[PDB]
């Protein structure tokens, strides 16, 4: 409720203290509750590209890194206007650190991490970080300690590194 000025804990991914508005379940615009899904770098990049191309088609009706950058710059200039410095920086950051190419690989990764039955934030971080070994991932993400077996995490990171392209 009001609680006047209520004290709160400092956010910490190690403790997974995301926030009161970043809880696991969120009420959608339809009135029901959905699990808070978190997008990895490639998944978020694909979502942004789909949104921008859909906006471009709506306005119209009413791979290598360099050509990708040229195409995204042209599409960004064509679709939206100015004051997109943050958007441009985010887009170039995503294209530079693009862990995946297209829909098939990101879908396979997301369904595998769903089958892992883990926290959405942790699986998104796993899909974002290109770790190599198991203990390395554990020390990179403190929230993974005492949650999954060492062999399973190591093998799933092995398949993720296998799915790495270019």
């Amino acid at each position: 409720r009001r609680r006047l000025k209520k004290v709160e804990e400092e956010e910490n991914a190690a403790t997974l203290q995301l926030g009161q508005e970043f809880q696991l379940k969120q009420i959608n615009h339809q009135g029901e509750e959905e699990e808070l899904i978190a997008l990895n770098l490639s998944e978020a990049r694909l979502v942004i590209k789909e949104a921008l191309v859909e906006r471009r088609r709506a306005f119209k009706r009413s791979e290598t890194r360099e050509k990708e950058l040229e195409s995204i710059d042209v599409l960004l200039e064509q679709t939206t206007g100015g004051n997109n410095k943050d958007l441009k920086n985010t887009m170039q950051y995503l294209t530079n650190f693009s862990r995946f190419r297209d829909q098939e690989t990101v879908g396979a990764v997301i369904q595998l991490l769903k089958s892992t039955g883990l926290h959405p934030f942790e699986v998104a971080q796993l899909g974002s970080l290109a770790c190599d070994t198991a203990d390395e991932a554990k020390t990179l993400i403190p929230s993974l300690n005492n949650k999954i077996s060492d062999d399973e995490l190591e093998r799933i990171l092995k398949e993720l590194s296998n799915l790495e392209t270019l």
Binding site: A38, L41, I48, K85, D86, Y93, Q125, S128, E136
Partner: protein
């Protein structure tokens, strides 16, 4: 990291704007106002998803004013950094106090106190960089940084990162 969240914004429309293109005006004014914006509550707001049909609802006339107050609900993509989170980035600048790394739409400043003693500043090389015994970190160099602090700023945020932990630094 990147998330998708359900946001809502109140828009006040003047009586002169109730033409057949009212939906277009509302959709355009939602943009240029929240696209790529920054706030402490949700971090950065980058783009709006599902633009084909944004929920605008009915819209209430403010009494004695005539302006209509719409509560437009939409899906937005956000980038809120979090404490103790490892993320990739690109070095853009170095200085005496530390170096700035480009992570998405934000610049994270890692101070000289948050590096191992083997890594030291070097202004002799042009541009000035940070050189260590085994590796060197220069401009436009990929580096992984762990964010451990977030500072709210005006129309932007400057987080605090580190590479002191194991397997942190240039790849």
């Amino acid at each position: 990291m990147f998330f998708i969240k359900d946001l809502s914004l109140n828009i006040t429309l003047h009586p002169s704007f109730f033409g057949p293109r009212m939906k277009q005006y509302l959709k355009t004014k939602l943009l240029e106002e929240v696209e790529g914006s920054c706030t402490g509550k949700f971090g950065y707001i980058l783009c709006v998803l599902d633009y084909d049909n944004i929920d605008i609802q009915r819209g209430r006339i403010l009494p004695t004013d005539g302006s209509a107050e719409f509560n437009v609900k939409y899906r937005a993509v956000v980038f809120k950094p979090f404490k103790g989170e490892v993320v990739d980035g690109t070095v853009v600048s170095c200085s005496q106090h530390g170096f700035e790394v480009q992570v998405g739409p934000m610049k994270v400043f890692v101070t000289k106190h948050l590096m191992p003693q083997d890594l030291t500043f070097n202004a002799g090389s042009n541009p000035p960089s940070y050189q260590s015994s085994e590796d060197v970190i220069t401009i436009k160099s990929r580096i992984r940084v762990k964010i451990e602090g977030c500072i709210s700023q005006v129309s932007s945020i400057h987080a605090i990162g580190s590479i002191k932990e194991d397997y942190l630094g240039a790849i």
